Paper text:
The specificity of substrate recognition among CRLs is conveyed by more than 250 different substrate receptors (SR), such as the cereblon (CRBN) and von Hippel-Lindau disease tumor suppressor (VHL).
To sample greater diversity of PROTAC exit vectors and linkers, we additionally designed AT7 (1) as an analogue of the previously disclosed AT110. While AT7, similar to AT1, branches out of the VHL ligand tert-butyl group via a thioether linker, it bears a fluoro-cyclopropyl capping group instead of the methyl group of AT1. This capping group is known to enhance the binding affinity to VHL as well as aid new PPIs within PROTAC ternary complexes. In cellular assays, AT7 exhibited potent cytotoxicity and BRD4 degradation. In an effort to understand these nuanced functional effects, we solved the cocrystal structure of the ternary complex between BRD4BD2: AT7:VCB to a resolution of 3.0 Å. As in the structure of MZ1 and macroPROTAC-1, VHLH110 sits underneath the bromodomain in a hydrophobic patch formed by BRD4W374, BRD4L385 and the di-methyl thiophene of the JQ1 warhead. It is therefore structurally plausible that a mutation of VHLH110 to a hydrophobic residue such as leucine at this position could have a beneficial impact on ternary binding affinity by enhancing favorable hydrophobic interactions. ARV-771, MZ1 and the macrocyclic BET degrader macroPROTAC-134 showed higher levels of augmentation, while sensitization for AT7 appeared attenuated.
Residue numbers in the entry:
A (entry chain A): 1 to 80, 85 to 102
B (entry chain B): 17 to 50, 56 to 112
C (entry chain C): 61 to 210
D (entry chain H): 350 to 459
Amino acid sequence: MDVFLMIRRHKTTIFTDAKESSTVFELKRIVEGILKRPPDEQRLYKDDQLLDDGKTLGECGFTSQTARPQAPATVGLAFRFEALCIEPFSSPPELPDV
Amino acid sequence: MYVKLISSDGHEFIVKREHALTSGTIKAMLSGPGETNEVNFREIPSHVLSKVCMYFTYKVRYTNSSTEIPEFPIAPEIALELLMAANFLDC
Amino acid sequence: PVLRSVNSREPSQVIFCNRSPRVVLPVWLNFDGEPQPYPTLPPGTGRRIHSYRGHLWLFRDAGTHDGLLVNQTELFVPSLNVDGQPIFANITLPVYTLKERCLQVVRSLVKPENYRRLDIVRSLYEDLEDHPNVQKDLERLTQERIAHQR
Amino acid sequence: VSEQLKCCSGILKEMFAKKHAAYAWPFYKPVDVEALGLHDYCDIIKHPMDMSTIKSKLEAREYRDAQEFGADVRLMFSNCYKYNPPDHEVVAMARKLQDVFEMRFAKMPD
Ligand SMILES: Cc1ncsc1-c1ccc(CNC(=O)[C@@H]2C[C@@H](O)CN2C(=O)[C@@H](NC(=O)C2(F)CC2)C(C)(C)SCCCCCCNC(=O)C[C@@H]2N=C(c3ccc(Cl)cc3)c3c(sc(C)c3C)-n3c(C)nnc32)cc1
């Protein structure tokens, strides 16, 4: 079963999919392939919660229902280690009258 | 393999090339007349472009389906800005 | 009188299956090509249907008249039940373009007389007022079959 | 009685014949109330009947004489006449099929 993730750090955001049976380490291998940073130099969080490299994405709580294409699940990313800092997206304006 | 979409307010969105080509505008911007990896949008903010990238993954994922697809959700708040973006991007 | 049901009296046992989150309004094209509304199917529900060979069907959102797919096409025409086996008609959402999907949400929130009071380009006004329509789509499908047969 | 029930099978066999299919087809299988979108058939018609059900009772030897078999064939037609107004196409079909049955059933050995 496929899980659709949104890997985030500062003002960067990576849209990628992964198997539920896939491990947290295999996700660091994808981040490396994109942002050119060995896996030992990165950490992955789920709402201020460190993820072990041995654990699978399913065991971390990312499931088909949680991490969907139209509504992907957020994964925190940090380099070096720096404090986890995800800049929030801009605010939508007030619902226009009508 | 991947492409970078940049919003009006800095935010960078790394997205699979095959996903981003869902947009006629993006397809035209980083193809050739007769090629680039980055595309900057001066007038599309984070909260919109993030939703557009979600649409790309949704569109690529469920065009291949044949049994049942889910609704693509749009919060009333984003509806107006996302329309104008969808018009500009031709998707 | 090009897209119409043939008046065969050859029965066809069908199953309509609503696998959309919308309330579905089935539309039978009668023998003159005029569209007839049938009772609506709630979401996730299915039911047995008595129809006939060469009868044209077409499915819509009961509320908004947004087009829906049936076995990944716009039109459903029953075959003859081989060994009395039912013909399945699986009704689903299409993968709407982000544009057509946004129009739906803006239409569902704004009253038609207030479309003009939205701060958007004149080309998005004319796209909002151009409601999904059965008569509109039938014209398209008629010309698609002309080029397909030629 | 054995020879009369052999006739009945022969009558029913002919009612299923392709030459009569043009007007016999509505009465082949039991009335599917969901498929026909009817919300009242079960209130009005207490004892449903059809040629398929009759064929089973014939092979299962549930008809003691030919007069028990005829009663069920007439019930089938009665149900159709009772439920539908006379102008409905199905009534015209029921009559054309009863014309066939009554003709053959009237030449029953005794
Ligand atoms: C509830 C619902 N929710 C979503 S869709 C739906 C739904 C509701 C009703 C139906 C009923 N089916 C139709 O309306 C079909 C669908 C479409 O293919 C068009 N259609 C027709 O029935 C068309 N008629 C024909 O093609 C023919 F008549 C030329 C052969 C219509 C729309 C032009 S006429 C059908 C509307 C009139 C309904 C009469 C209501 N009465 C009955 O159903 C009584 C029933 N009639 C019939 C009957 C009706 C017509 C014919 Cl010449 C012969 C028998 C009947 C049987 S048994 C059996 C297998 C049938 C078909 N029957 C018996 C015996 N006694 N009564 C009956 C289907 C779906």
